[PDB]
Design a protein around this ligand. Sequence first.
Ligand SMILES: COCCN(C)S(=O)(=O)N1Cc2ccc(Cl)cc2[C@H](C(=O)Nc2cncc3ccccc23)C1
Ligand SMILES: COCCN(C)S(=O)(=O)N1Cc2ccc(Cl)cc2[C@H](C(=O)Nc2cncc3ccccc23)C1
Ligand SMILES: [Cl-]
Lengths: 305, 298
Amino acid sequence: SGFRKMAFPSGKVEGCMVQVTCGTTTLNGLWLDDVVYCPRHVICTSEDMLNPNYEDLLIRKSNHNFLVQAGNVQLRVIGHSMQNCVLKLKVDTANPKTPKYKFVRIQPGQTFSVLACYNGSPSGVYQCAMRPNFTIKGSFLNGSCGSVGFNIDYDCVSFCYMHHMELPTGVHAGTDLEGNFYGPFVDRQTAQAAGTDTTITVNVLAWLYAAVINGDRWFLNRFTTTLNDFNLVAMKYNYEPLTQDHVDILGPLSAQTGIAVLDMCASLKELLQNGMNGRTILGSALLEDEFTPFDVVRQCSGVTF
Amino acid sequence: SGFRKMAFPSGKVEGCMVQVTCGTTTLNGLWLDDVVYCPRHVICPNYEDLLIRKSNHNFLVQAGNVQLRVIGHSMQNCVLKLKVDTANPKTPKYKFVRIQPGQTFSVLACYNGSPSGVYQCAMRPNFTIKGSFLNGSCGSVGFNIDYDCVSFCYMHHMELPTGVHAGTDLEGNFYGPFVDRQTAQAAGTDTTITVNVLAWLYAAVINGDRWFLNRFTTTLNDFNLVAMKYNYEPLTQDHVDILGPLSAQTGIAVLDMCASLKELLQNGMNGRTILGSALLEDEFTPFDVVRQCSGVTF
Ligand SMILES: COCCN(C)S(=O)(=O)N1Cc2ccc(Cl)cc2[C@H](C(=O)Nc2cncc3ccccc23)C1
Ligand SMILES: COCCN(C)S(=O)(=O)N1Cc2ccc(Cl)cc2[C@H](C(=O)Nc2cncc3ccccc23)C1
Ligand SMILES: [Cl-]
């Protein structure tokens, strides 16, 4: 019993964190085999950030301009290349602590663990989700750039995010490990803002199914709904549209609890209309949207209470 | 910017988790040097009588894909100490510390000696923890990290009927009036950790959430009279002193913030949130707020 925002154990990722320094800029890098991956803005000054020409800035650099530090050991850079918004620094030593890994690009609504780092040293781990507006509500200070997001289903680390910047609303933007940004963002200091965000509907439904598994049913009702009528109501509360894929994905949780997806959609509609009336659901007074159907199946018991 | 429920990096603890099997019971153990620590209920009620009937070879200890050999055993309070023939090469610098209610720690939840997740939690005033544990999680540990040293403070033993959890320090002394057996046990009435709610209100002000700030202040006695009405723990002069740094950084005196908390307790949030929450959060200590809003590393 219980339901917590749970992160993956971070050890496999901690053994990959390094410090990358270029001139006056210091940030984090991810050392996998003989390559250190880091944001390409490590080659920029603050002035350069308005309209940086990364290709022109990079051609002026040599291997020995990049200082890479792994713990108390200085790694030697023997090559460099840029792939989209990430810099790949070839080093002369392979990381002996390299785990089994993959680079995966995720979709909005997906969750992942973030190992926040400063000066190549891990400070904390937390769980978060890729928002529908492609930002993440992280906890990052100056020097956190290069910190990574990951999942560890089984013994393989799937790296899905690398931190690049903080937007004016305090939310965060970054890339996959191939250097492609999530969202319409650029690694440039522009009048750049997060679009209006929405609630991840399929995740709120998963979390309501989690509450039923843990023994709480106060929010259920005798009604059902069509998918179209649910979406017409949901969009009035800034909730993401629920697709047939989302309904299919919730199938297992529907079979375990005995509550049809469209019946759970009816309960959600009523919660949006009424509020909680002094009650909580899994210790929360708001509808939680940062647990996926997969996270609920992984954390909750296989036997409903 | 941002404020998350943040756990310590778990790697130094992951390298200590092992699986312990005795008969039909399988649970987790903590392997430090040549000793594996685990709940004594793995042998399950006279515990010394149950233990005297066991030999070293009855305990099967598995570290990854390697079977460790048990060469001795002893009991210390509610913790079983299994002497093994191999010292853990991954043993970090560590200490066993007993924490107080209100203090927070990270939990590395494990099943079959394999870490599955890490989360942050607090020792409630009623000595329980609101954790996330299923069958097989016994032996999972709670810890904090100070520089390069792991301070182990909790070992999981059981789930109470309300779904909350109970356990011991690493010397086997329970937190709370609990016993390690199947009997009528219940968590006492819980209270809110006042000094922690205040720390979280300072974290909100630091992050640019000031709507609850007001021109008023209060005495410590008047604040405590109000706080007792809402099942909040009393605020002591030690708590006021501990909040000193956050008070100097934001310019809001601790009794100035107490007047804000009193108004929130008497009138609610009125449709508003603080750091994305509609409830007053009490599982961040003043030290957690300072650490997360400064970037301390390990
Ligand atoms: C203070 O607002 C943050 C943005 N800045 C105006 S800045 O610090 O000068 N800035 C500009 C900028 C522009 C583009 C890119 Cl790709 C990166 C960056 C940097 C950036 O975003 N770094 C940070 C990342 N995460 C978290 C932070 C938290 C605090 C402070 C920097 C944080 C630096
Ligand atoms: C209905 O929940 C209580 C479960 N038990 C009644 S039990 O499974 O029979 N039970 C009895 C018991 C008595 C004393 C001690 Cl020290 C430990 C234990 C065990 C216990 O508490 N183990 C669990 C720990 N954390 C989480 C759980 C979650 C589910 C199920 C066991 C969980 C087992
Ligand atoms: Cl995805």
